[PDB]
């Protein structure tokens, strides 16, 4: 991805040999920057609504003629708007993004009838998985605000048209916008962005209201639709070793009809439960989480104990074999993330919008058994453990039990 | 313009096919086999799926545990799936972990233990799978759809097989199945992503050279199905969403109407209330359904097999008092493929498909799945230029002629699951397959 | 006739100096003799509403405008059945006769008409 | 109240000079003894359903002919069933209670159609007050199980007919039953209970599954129906001084259109918020709570800070005047509790069932300023503060902020 | 007639030794000639249900009993329209002809009749 600048907008493109191009606008407008709860989700859903030059209806009918597709999502850091089309149709897509950022008519009926109902279905689909809920709850406990804001719009706190219009006034500005073009000729994209995004406001960098503060605690989301448990450990100094530790501890199987050779995978033997360790770097803080879902609260409780033990055991000693297995699983995870268009866009988006240089999968550091065990030791000896239980919460573990 | 698919053969008749992409760092290698559940009879139905479980249960060298460790140490993963006509076993890895992954795949296919102890252990796991598919409503609907459309025929059988067979499958019949079916002339070794073709051919010569050849080598994707107009109703008043599939007999992979049926399918298209753009789609059915809240979703499909296919639509709805309208309007849109479609809809669908067929291939696993599917169904990878020409050859006259012989006034296979009291009887549904005004 | 039609034709007239010079005074007298202001109505209260497009435009009115319209209709119905006219503050003054509904119906119709056009597009 | 024993059942009665009697059966079957969440609420609601001798319908029609009334409630400790009638109708009411305890037909249709829907309306009415929710949430955090069980049945944990029938098998037994008769001739009640409750099982004392354990923490209940905040402090050794401290800190006004002279009342000045300090003795543990409701989360937050300060200030010094004011407000609170038939019944019920001799309002101890300040000091410096926020929880305080 | 009536009269007969000796054999042949078992029905499936009391009793059936009744009615309807009789396991055997509904309807009617009585009470 050759990083450049076109009319004040950071543009990164990588040419390829495929008939398919992906163009993504990455906006610094994720939920950590959200003025009011849920506004970044609503703004994401308000992309490709009526603009002054082109109605939502006309856009969709013309997109069907190009056979293009549209993908949008919100993270804690970004809003990502991606289009996938044939290479030759690049100018149309650039101009479409320009219309969205410059000329969206944010109309009250779109919010009531189109945008908010779709945002609500989006969230309900995600929450069907109790593990999603548990990991969301864990961020809320760990960070409270900023990273602790909900990503998604909720019913209890309604977003108004004035909320969304104000946020868009901040976000849709040259200072908060990065363009990422996969299989796009880099010189051609710079020329097009340079003409189309010239009259976009300059604006100012959106910032998190307040510094990131870490907290421990418990969340007990009582649902009737499945059971899950997250054990998170907030990290004050995000370090790349936690990727290796996440992949080492593992949890999912690398093979059909198997349990797996990872410590966390082996904690689920004899139970219909699954586990996944994940590490979330947010630049200024991190979260190391272990999420366990299952149908039995008794089995979840059983696995949860084994999971925290596994982490303690790792803090004791890692073998050389296990450290190499961690390097391999971690390099692979890095590679596939840079391939997947959704995650790819945000990776270069972070490089462009912040200044965090991307770590190429081929440059992923190999951590010795000493470095891995040291990282696990810090986590086992955390002052601020977070536990989010979802489901039959009376039957799930508590932080002080773990 | 994508890189050329290179293809080589071995002496036994194993095909090697590759598409390199120097922009990615991962690679998907695997074995596509032209064999699946359809190759079983009634007594060993379930064997192919049973084997898939045992393939990962240990080989003559590596035990179950060693197998797990070896893959964990590689860094990527292995995956497998058995369908009616196709079995796949693949490995996604890093660029330079490809020789390891080819070696593991060659081992689990050729040299699997199939130990009585493991047969007995999986026999319970698979028995539990019989009572948990019940939740995957789309799969329940499609399995009943095949069972009724191809009543008492091999394509009508499920992949899991009956409970009775699961209890009686022996290592003998497992071994017999994979010896008869997993032959070199039925197998394709596929690599996509960061693979060198010449390297992959060498790995094939090293690991897959002692594969049996079949006695009578037919070409890849070589097959008589007699469709039954019929219905299965699985009424369940406690479910909030109705799931309905309606299909007619469709087209095989090598039909001359293959592209015509895809264009017709694209004219109806898909719809999902949860997606923001779906209320603005051009499809008439989409507009009717969204304006009247008739459905949560619908998905047109055109499934092909070697010698038949199913063409139809899958609908989901919570609108339990207007299921009649949903089915009525759907079948009246099908009638219009016979009576009313012109260059307006046909050229719009062609535009959408020319991109759609290329867009689908957006990762190494998708590319490998495309090379493998095309090689095992058509005997070759069809270039995008050829595909663009075949789509361009579809006229409105072709669509009308196809719909008049395939849809118009034809029997349907119909499956309803859930609160389907409002779904009328077979005659009233089938009467919507024609229009009295025409 | 569609509100779109009426609004476009009106704009052609209002552009032409000659046309506006002769039409605007007539239109003002017409409105005075029409007498809907003497029942406390605003012009837009009289537009036929039993149409999908109009039902959608009315649903998009802000709640305040919608509550006030309901009261004007009820009040006018009471004047009609009593054979009385509005007096005092119930009479709509020319400055209060605002086109509160026209922008909503124009947006509804814009989409409806674009949908009709796009349903007839021909790939070239 | 003359405590006696009639056929294995403890009976307490106090004759008076009024035409109206109150007979109450107090059962050791409150929510701390529950086997399944909500069963004690459901059992309470199943009182005066169909018995074998007399249908619910016949009972209600005959109760109307006597002009009697029926009152039932569940606490953490007891189920209380009270009837109010004319003095002379005593034998009917004794026999009615006997039919309920001996011969209730627990029929599935009563549970589905009658009992559970009424239990659900009961809860929804209580939860309309966000302060009720906050104080319930605080007990759940503080005790987890036992005293931490919910008092009321909830939708997420369905009580079955077998659950209720099992619990009733334990509870409806001579060992768990006390009869309390207000304005009932004590000799007459003993004679009637002795004939009517003779064939009741003896059974065994119902016990709390597990010992009472104390925990600190936070609960954050998102409602859209108003705002409240409880600050609770679990007490390991319940002492009578906390009554005096609750009344001292106060919170409600003692005269119309006024704020009040109590430290917590004075914390609300300039805000439309109310406050109430409460102390809950449960024998083996206690809870000291301060609950603040209001419409503004900002004002609640403001008062919450002042409330915690008030408690700290009390730990420093109380004047002699203030200690006497605490004795006065506390004696009065004791007196009115022994007067109200609802609370009266449970007070003697606790003396009969448990053995905790009642403290007469005239024997309420006077605490010196030293003893009061020491009690407040012990609370401000607790290791296990509980905070339950209800409403716009993103805007309400957290434990670590207080 | 009410189920209560039928059940009470039946109990009077079953009590009397003489009466039962002559009535029970008749009742058994009646049921054999009635032929409802040959359509796979249980006796209680035949009771008229279009009354408030019966609708309430049916709503109180346990879910499994209710699902099985629905199947017997559908199956009997299919035999009726086909002009066939049940064979094999579809025939109701005498031991399967259980009074699954009688206790529910007797409870519903007990309350309904007590309500009628109590609506006519006279304070003495």
**Which chain A residues are Cβ-neighbours of C118 within 8 angstroms?**
57-58, 61
The residue from B52, B85, B249, B369 that is catalytic is: B52
Q: Which tokens in the block code for residue D162? A: 């077998």
Angstrom distance (rounded) from CA D302 to CA D309: 11
Claim to verify: residue A291 and residue A161 sit in the same structural domain: no
Residue whose structure tokens are 């009472």 = D212
φ, ψ of residue A229 to 5 degrees: the values are -150, 125
Do residues A181 and A189 touch, judged by C-beta distance below 8 A? yes
Using N-to-C axis directions, what is the helix angle for A369-380 and A297-316, rounded to 10°? 130
Burial B419-434 (b: 16+ CB within 10 A, else e): bbebbeeeeebbebbb
Q: Which experiment gave this structure? A: cryo-EM
Residue A206 within a domain: no
User: What are the angstrom distances between the C-alpha of E61 and each of E68, E74, E99?
Assistant: 11, 18, 12
Claim to verify: residue D357 and residue D256 sit in the same structural domain: yes
In chain E, the largest separation of any two C-alpha atoms, in whole Å, equals 63
Q: Which tokens in the block code for residue A90? A: 């690049």
Using N-to-C axis directions, what is the helix angle for A341-353 and A320-339, rounded to 10°? 90
Claim to verify: residue A133 and residue A6 sit in the same structural domain: yes
Range of the domain at C75: 1-124
User: What are the angstrom distances between the C-alpha of B113 and each of B107, B109, B170, B175, B176?
Assistant: 10, 10, 13, 10, 13
Contact C114 A58 (CB under 8 A): yes
Listed in sequence order, the residues at least 6 apart from B240 whose beta carbon sits closer than 8 Å to its beta carbon are B318, B418, B419
Claim to verify: residue A254 and residue A168 sit in the same structural domain: no
Q: Do chains C and A touch (3 or more CB pairs under 8 A)?
A: yes
Angstrom distance (rounded) from CA B235 to CA B425: 13
CA nearest neighbour of E30 among B264, C86, E22? E22
Best of A20, A57, A64, A358 to mutate (most B CBs within 10 Å, chain B): A64
**Which chain A residues are Cβ-neighbours of C63 within 8 angstroms?**
none
Contact A61 C111 (CB under 8 A): no
The reply to whether B282 touches chain C by the CB within 8 Å rule is: yes
Angstrom distance (rounded) from CA B161 to CA E16: 60
- DSSP-H helix ranges across C35-93: 52-59, 63-82
CA nearest neighbour of A134 among A255, A230, A65? A230
Q: Which tokens in the block code for residue A138? A: 């864990």
Positive or negative: CA dihedral E87, E89, E91, E93? positive
Claim to verify: residue A253 and residue A174 sit in the same structural domain: no
Listed in sequence order, the residues at least 6 apart from D369 whose beta carbon sits closer than 8 Å to its beta carbon are D317, D318, D319, D320, D322, D323
**Which chain D residues are Cβ-neighbours of A392 within 8 angstroms?**
157
At C54 the three-state DSSP class reads helix
Angstrom distance (rounded) from CA B182 to CA B175: 10
Q: Which residue of C lies nearest to A108 if distances are taken between CA atoms?
A: C60
Number of domains in chain D: 2
Contact B122 A328 (CB under 8 A): no
The reply to whether A105 touches chain C by the CB within 8 Å rule is: no
Angstrom distance (rounded) from CA B36 to CA B146: 15
Range of the domain at A323: 217-401
Number of domains in chain C: 1
Q: Which tokens in the block code for residue D101? A: 């305890």
Closest-CA distance of chain A to residue B29, Å: 15
For D65, the closest of E107, E114, E123 (CB atoms) is E123
Q: Please, which residues bridge with residue A224 across strands?
A: none
Q: In the complex, which subunits touch C with 3 or more CB pairs below 8 angstroms? A: A, B
Residue A209 within a domain: no
- DSSP-H helix ranges across A76-219: 90-103, 108-109, 116-127, 130-143, 161-171, 186-196
Q: Which tokens in the block code for residue B236? A: 């369940």
Contact E107 D107 (CB under 8 A): yes
Contact A61 C121 (CB under 8 A): yes
Q: Residue A224 class from Cβ within 10 Å (0-12 exposed, 13-18 middle, 19+ buried)?
A: exposed
Q: Please, which residues bridge with residue D289 across strands?
A: D232, D278
Claim to verify: residue A142 and residue A114 sit in the same structural domain: yes
CATH classification of the domain holding D96: 3.30.830.10
Among residues A143, A167, A197, the one where a domain terminates is A197
If contacts are CB pairs under 8 Å, which of residues 382-401 in chain A contact chain D?
392, 394, 398, 400
Q: Which tokens in the block code for residue D280? A: 């809950």
Angstrom distance (rounded) from CA B374 to CA B354: 17
Strand order across the beta sheet in which B15-20 lies: B6-9, B15-20, B187-193, B26-33, B87-94, B77-82
For A61, the closest of C60, C62, C118 (CB atoms) is C118
φ, ψ of residue D155 to 5 degrees: the values are -70, -30
Claim to verify: residue D221 and residue D146 sit in the same structural domain: no
Do residues B69 and A261 touch, judged by C-beta distance below 8 A? yes
Q: Which tokens in the block code for residue E24? A: 């029970």
**Which chain C residues are Cβ-neighbours of A58 within 8 angstroms?**
114, 118
Do residues D356 and D16 touch, judged by C-beta distance below 8 A? no
The reply to whether A362 touches chain D by the CB within 8 Å rule is: no
**Which chain E residues are Cβ-neighbours of D58 within 8 angstroms?**
114, 118
Closest-CA distance of chain A to residue C48, Å: 21
At D367 the three-state DSSP class reads coil
Closest-CA distance of chain D to residue E60, Å: 6
Residue D205 within a domain: no
Q: What is the DSSP secondary structure assignment for residue A115, as one 8-state letter? A: I
Angstrom distance (rounded) from CA A13 to CA B402: 44
Listed in sequence order, the residues at least 6 apart from A263 whose beta carbon sits closer than 8 Å to its beta carbon are A248, A249, A250, A310, A313, A314
φ, ψ of residue D274 to 5 degrees: the values are -125, 160
| H or E stretch covering B204 | helix B197-207
Do residues B99 and B70 touch, judged by C-beta distance below 8 A? no
User: What are the angstrom distances between the C-alpha of A344 and each of A19, A23, A40, A171, D109?
Assistant: 19, 11, 20, 21, 59
Strand order across the beta sheet in which A386-390 lies: A217-221, A386-390, A227-235, A286-294, A273-281
| CATH code at B6-208 | 3.30.830.10
Do residues E107 and E50 touch, judged by C-beta distance below 8 A? no
Angstrom distance (rounded) from CA C54 to CA D269: 52
Residue D76 within a domain: yes
Which residues does a gap of C–N over 2.5 Å follow in chain C? none
Is B19 annotated in the active site? no
User: What are the angstrom distances between the C-alpha of E9 and each of B27, D18, E5, E48?
Assistant: 84, 52, 6, 19
Q: What is the DSSP secondary structure assignment for residue D381, as one 8-state letter? A: T
Contact C123 B351 (CB under 8 A): yes
DSSP letters for B91-148: EEEEGGGHHHHHHHHHHHHHSB---HHHHHHHHHHHHHHTTTGGG-HHHHHHHHHHHH
**Which chain D residues are Cβ-neighbours of E60 within 8 angstroms?**
108-109
CA nearest neighbour of A200 among A95, A111, A108, A106? A95
The reply to whether D105 touches chain A by the CB within 8 Å rule is: no
At D379 the three-state DSSP class reads helix
How long is chain B?
438
Among residues A197, A228, A247, the one where a domain terminates is A197
Residue D203 within a domain: no
If contacts are CB pairs under 8 Å, which of residues 259-278 in chain B contact chain A?
273-277
Claim to verify: residue A41 and residue A157 sit in the same structural domain: yes
Listed in sequence order, the residues at least 6 apart from A257 whose beta carbon sits closer than 8 Å to its beta carbon are B52, B53, B56, B57, B122, B125
Do residues D272 and D296 touch, judged by C-beta distance below 8 A? yes
Contact E114 D109 (CB under 8 A): no
Do residues D276 and D291 touch, judged by C-beta distance below 8 A? yes
Q: Which tokens in the block code for residue B59? A: 């080989």
Across the D:E interface, residue pairs with CB atoms under 8 Å apart total 18
Angstrom distance (rounded) from CA D177 to CA E11: 40
Angstrom distance (rounded) from CA D211 to CA D144: 11
C62: number of Cβ within 10 Å: 11
Angstrom distance (rounded) from CA B4 to CA B192: 11
Contact C122 B343 (CB under 8 A): yes
Contact B358 A20 (CB under 8 A): yes
Residue D315 within a domain: yes
Claim to verify: residue D186 and residue D230 sit in the same structural domain: no
Do residues B309 and B302 touch, judged by C-beta distance below 8 A? yes
Claim to verify: residue D238 and residue D156 sit in the same structural domain: no
Angstrom distance (rounded) from CA B273 to CA B286: 10
Q: Residue B401 class from Cβ within 10 Å (0-12 exposed, 13-18 middle, 19+ buried)?
A: middle
Q: Which tokens in the block code for residue B238? A: 């406690």
Angstrom distance (rounded) from CA A152 to CA B221: 48
């Amino acid at each position: 991805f050759s990083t450049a600048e076109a009319a004040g907008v950071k543009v990164a493109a990588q040419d390829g040999q495929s008939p398919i191009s992906d163009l993504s606008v990455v906006l610094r407008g994720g939920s950590r920057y959200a003025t009011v709860p849920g506004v970044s989700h609503i703004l994401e859903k308000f992309a490709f609504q009526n603009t002054v030059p082109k109605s939502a209806l006309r856009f969709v009918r013309e997109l069907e003629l190009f056979g293009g597709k549209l993908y949008t999502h919100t993270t804690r850091e970004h809003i990502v708007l991606r289009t996938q089309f044939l290479k030759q149709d690049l100018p149309y897509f650039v101009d479409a993004f320009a219309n969205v950022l410059k000329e969206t008519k944010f109309q009250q009926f779109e919010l009531t009838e189109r945008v908010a109902p779709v945002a609500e279905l989006d969230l309900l689909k995600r929450e069907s998985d109790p593990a999603f809920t548990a990991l969301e709850a864990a961020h809320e406990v760990a960070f409270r605000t900023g990273l602790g804001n909900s990503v998604y719009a909720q019913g209890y706190s309604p977003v108004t048209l004035e909320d969304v219009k104000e946020f868009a006034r901040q976000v849709y500005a040259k200072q908060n916008v990065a363009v990422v073009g996969n299989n796009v000729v880099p010189a051609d994209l710079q020329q097009l962005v340079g003409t189309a995004f010239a009259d976009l406001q300059e604006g100012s960098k959106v910032t998190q209201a307040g510094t990131t503060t870490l907290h421990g605690g418990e969340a007990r989301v009582r649902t009737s639709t499945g059971n899950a448990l997250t054990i998170a450990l907030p990290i004050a100094e995000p370090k790349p070793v936690y990727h290796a530790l996440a992949s080492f501890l593992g949890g999912p199987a690398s093979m059909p009809w198997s349990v797996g050779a990872s410590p966390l995978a082996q904690a689920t033997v004899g139970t219909h439960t699954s586990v996944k360790a994940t590490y979330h770097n947010y630049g200024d803080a991190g979260l190391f989480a272990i999420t366990i879902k299952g149908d039995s609260p008794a089995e979840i409780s059983q696995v949860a104990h084994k999971a925290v033990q596994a982490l303690k055991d790792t803090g004791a000693e890692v073998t050389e074999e296990q450290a190499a297995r961690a390097y391999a699983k971690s390099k692979f995870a890095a590679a596939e993330a840079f391939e997947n268009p959704d995650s790819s866009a945000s990776v270069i988006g972070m490089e462009l919008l912040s200044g965090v240089s991307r770590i190429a999968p081929e440059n992923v550091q190999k951590f010795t058994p000493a470095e891995l065990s040291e990282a696990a030791a810090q986590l086992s000896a955390s002052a601020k453990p977070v536990v989010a239980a979802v489901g039959q919460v009376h039957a799930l573990p508590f932080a002080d039990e773990l | 313009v994508s890189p050329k698919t290179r293809t080589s053969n071995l002496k036994n008749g194993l095909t090697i096919a590759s598409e390199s992409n120097p922009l990615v760092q991962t690679a998907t290698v695997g074995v596509w086999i032209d064999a699946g559940s359809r190759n079983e009879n009634a007594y060993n139905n379930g064997t192919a799926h049973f084997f898939e479980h045992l393939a990962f249960k240990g080989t003559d060298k590596r035990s179950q545990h060693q197998l797990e460790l070896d893959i964990e140490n590689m860094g990527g993963h292995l995956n497998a799936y058995t369908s009616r006509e196709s079995t796949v076993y693949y490995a996604k890895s890093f660029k330079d972990d490809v020789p390891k992954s080819v070696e593991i795949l060659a081992d689990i296919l050729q040299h699997s233990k199939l130990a009585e102890s493991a047969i007995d252990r999986e026999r319970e796991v698979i028995t539990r799978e019989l009572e948990e598919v019940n939740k995957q409503y789309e799969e329940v609907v499609f399995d009943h759809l095949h069972a009724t459309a191809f009543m008492n025929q091999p394509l009508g059988r499920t992949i899991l097989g009956p409970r009775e067979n699961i209890q009686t499958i022996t290592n003998t019949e497992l071994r017999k199945f994979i010896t008869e079916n997993y032959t070199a002339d039925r197998m394709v070794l596929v690599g996509a992503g960061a693979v060198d073709h010449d390297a992959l051919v060498e790995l094939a010569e090293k690991y897959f050279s002692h594969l049996p050849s079949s006695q009578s080598p037919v070409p890849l994707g070589t097959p008589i199905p007699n469709f039954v107009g019929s219905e299965v109703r699985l009424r369940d008043d406690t479910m909030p969403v109705a799931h309905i599939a309606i299909a007619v007999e469709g087209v095989s992979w090598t039909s001359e109407d293959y592209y015509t049926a895809l264009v017709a399918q694209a004219i109806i298209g898909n719809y999902d209330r949860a997606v923001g753009t779906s209320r603005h789609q051009g499809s008439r059915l989409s507009n009717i359904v969204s304006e009247n809240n008739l459905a949560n979703s619908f998905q047109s499909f055109s499934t092909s097999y070697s010698d038949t296919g199913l063409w139809g639509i899958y609908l989901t709805s919570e609108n339990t008092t207007q299921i009649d309208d949903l089915v009525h309007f759907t079948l009246k849109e099908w009638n219009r493929l016979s009576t009313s479609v012109s260059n307006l809809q046909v050229e719009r669908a062609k535009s959408q498909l020319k991109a759609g067929l290329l867009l689908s291939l957006d990762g190494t696993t998708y590319v490998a799945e495309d090379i493998g599917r095309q090689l095992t169904t058509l005997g070759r990878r069809v270039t995008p230029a050829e595909v663009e020409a075949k789509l361009e050859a579809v006229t409105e006259h072709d669509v009308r002629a196809w719909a008049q012989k395939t849809l118009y006034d034809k029997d349907i296979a119909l499956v309803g699951l859930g609160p389907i009291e409002g779904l009328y009887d077979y005659n009233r549904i089938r009467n919507d397959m024609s229009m009295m005004r025409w | 006739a569609s509100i779109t039609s009426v609004v476009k034709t009106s704009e052609l007239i209002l552009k032409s100096p000659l046309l506006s010079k002769i039409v605007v005074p007539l239109a003002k007298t017409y409105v005075k003799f029409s007498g809907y202001r003497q029942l406390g109505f605003k012009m837009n209260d009289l537009i036929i509403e039993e149409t999908p497009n109009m039902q959608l435009a009315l649903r998009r009115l802000p709640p305040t405008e919608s509550y006030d319209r309901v009261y004007r209709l009820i009040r006018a119905t009471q004047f009609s059945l009593s054979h009385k006219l509005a007096t005092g503050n119930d009479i709509t003054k020319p400055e209060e006769d605002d086109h509160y509904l026209i922008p909503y119906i124009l947006d509804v119709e814009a989409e409806a008409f674009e949908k009709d056009a796009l349903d007839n597009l021909e790939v070239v």
